[PDB]
């Protein structure tokens, strides 16, 4: 059984880019629902697997994918954001961005374009293609995890679900992205790239 | 080139079930963006078709589907809601609900379950299966139109996109559905069933 | 661990509608591969679930769905076909077809149209919608099981995968369907409807 | 209105890797059906677009995608195969394979794995990611074109549809791939890379 990961920072840490209400509602309601439904799906699905009902497993596949992907995506998202984060990434990760996207601003605009291009709910991901050994930009609809679906190891995540920004930015998602670029925890992305690149 | 259909009722007509801010933002921003992107996609796609580029047409298919389905779905949605609407449908449509779902409350709970079951963005639809000649409950993700995709002629539509209810009901979609059941324009659904059943 | 179900009839029973080579290759190779890959996916996926890796489970979901659906679909398919089968279904199932499709020939042409309409690999299904309590015609791509995906309890199945008919009928699938209508085991479909309707 | 492209080589040119029957049936039946259905879909869809029926366009989208993608994919496939082709690619394309996949044999095994991994019908593609400027391996189900869907400009294509190999290799697709590696027209792939890389 999974558990809800506590935020490393208080709800009002992301002022004013993300107001306290959005963080509070997001974490305490949407991620909590994801983890609770994940636990329910896990217990039902495990008893189905023990019974040996393939039809039941295939029926439960969408719910398990949705809840587990939501949990994983939001767990990555919370770590990816810091009150102290933002600005310009440093170290080998910056060089990787330079050699894969030409410049950091080009990476910013490409990730912003990918995030806005998500029709409906979804996620915009910066991930390390380990087999090819280079950074990539992806967009995954709904709560589809990056590593589970595409195989790319996730480094940076942007939640373009409407619950992430509607209470503050209404329909202008580009403003939400421009703001969230100020709270990215580039140190955590550096740790993820170090652990992934290795 | 398509145009944005004006609301038959003012923005504050749906008080208090749907506050004025949600109706105003929805109609003036989301549907306007859908119709504008639909016009852009139509002109680009028509010049591509005249040129005879199948690859360009297949590339433009997702954008055309998204924008056109959004326009159609919201155009149906605005007519489906009335300040005077709500309560209990009358006439042959009520008998059709009785003979297809057992009772009107059973239809209400089935449509509510279908609408809540939409993972992410989507739409919950009551539609007349014309070939089989009976009412059906469907759920279509994102802005997929009912008639275009499933072939069911749409009668009643519920927008479970987060922009439809987040500013008022936050994460509890069931409360949004319970409220929207008070503003359903059953007379327009009766007209749609008469024109469809015929 | 699952096992390959033996055919109730020998390979050459379906002469001349389905030649012995197609039945032999189908059962001994395609279904055997499905069940073997299903066993492998089950063991890998069960150890992943015991470990508690949601990402691994979501990664293994497509393979499990493909193999398990192939196994279930072919297990239903083998029972649905009999050397003695064919002709005109008798009993309450015939009345159900009459009241849901108008006539048996209308059901035949509707199921044939659904089977031919499958773009690529897939399956054409006659299934009892238990909640609505009436027969329905569905088409499921690749090896997607009917009950697992759509919830319809499967009664009759038609494999429109190219391995089912290419060695004999080449590209004309309609001839394959017209032939397979002579070997349908309507008694087994009657048993399935009795067990389902109940 | 599109037309069926004639084969640059006679039907029996690919002996013994691809027998004359497979080439004859493939080109004269499957691709002919694709182009005919593409013409029908184009005329219906163009009159729908002129009428201004978005629902009709969205309904016709799947058929247009299927037929047009089939036509494009098979038109690329016929050029990609030559009686004189096979062996080891020469020139800058070989260096591109070396720098993107490590060695030519690694590219061969990766493309073979991608082609076999296609569950059901599909296509395995070697394509130049123009934005990132490097070669990539992709798999597209059914008749989905590479450039239309993923944006990768197609260079080499492998038809893993069962009509491509079932009459000769039955269920062992790996043998079909090992054989088709002897008839790849690397000169045409070099031309495609030159025109794409530019
Ligand atoms: Mn979220
Ligand atoms: Mn809406
Ligand atoms: Mn089969
Ligand atoms: Mn082909």
Residue numbers in the entry:
A (entry chain A), B (entry chain C), C (entry chain B), D (entry chain D): 25 to 222
Sentences from the paper on this structure:
SOD2 is a manganese-binding member of the SOD family that is expressed in the mitochondria and catalyzes the oxidation of two O2− ions to molecular O2 and H2O2 (46). Our BaR methodology classified a total of 50,014 single particle projections for the SOD2 class. Based on these projections, we constructed a high-resolution density map of 2.91 Å. The global architecture of SOD2 is a homotetramer formed by a dimer of dimers. Similarly to existing crystal structures, each subunit of SOD2 contains an N-terminal domain primarily consisting of two long α helices and a C-terminal domain made up of a core three stranded β sheet flanked by a set of six α helices. A central cavity is formed by the interface of each subunit’s β-sheet core, while dimer interfaces consist of α-helical bundles from the N-terminal domains. Elements of both domains contribute to the Mn2+-binding site for each subunit. Specifically, this cavity is formed by the H50 and H98 from the N-terminal domain and D183 and H187 from the C-terminal domain.
Here we report the use of single particle cryo-EM to identify multiple proteins from three enriched heterogeneous fractions prepared from human liver mitochondrial lysate. Using this approach, we were able to simultaneously identify and solve cryo-EM structures of nine different human mitochondrial enzymes: short chain acyl-CoA dehydrogenase (SCAD), medium chain acyl-CoA dehydrogenase (MCAD), isovaleryl-CoA dehydrogenase (IVD), delta (3, 5)-delta dienoyl-CoA isomerase (ECH1), aspartate aminotransferase (GOT2), glutamate dehydrogenase (GLUD1), mitochondrial superoxide dismutase 2 (SOD2), catalase (CAT), and mitochondrial aldehyde dehydrogenase (ALDH2). Functionally, the three acyl-CoA dehydrogenases—SCAD, MCAD and IVD—are involved in beta oxidation and amino acid catabolism. Finally, SOD2, CAT, and ALDH2 are all involved in clearing toxic byproducts of oxidative respiration.
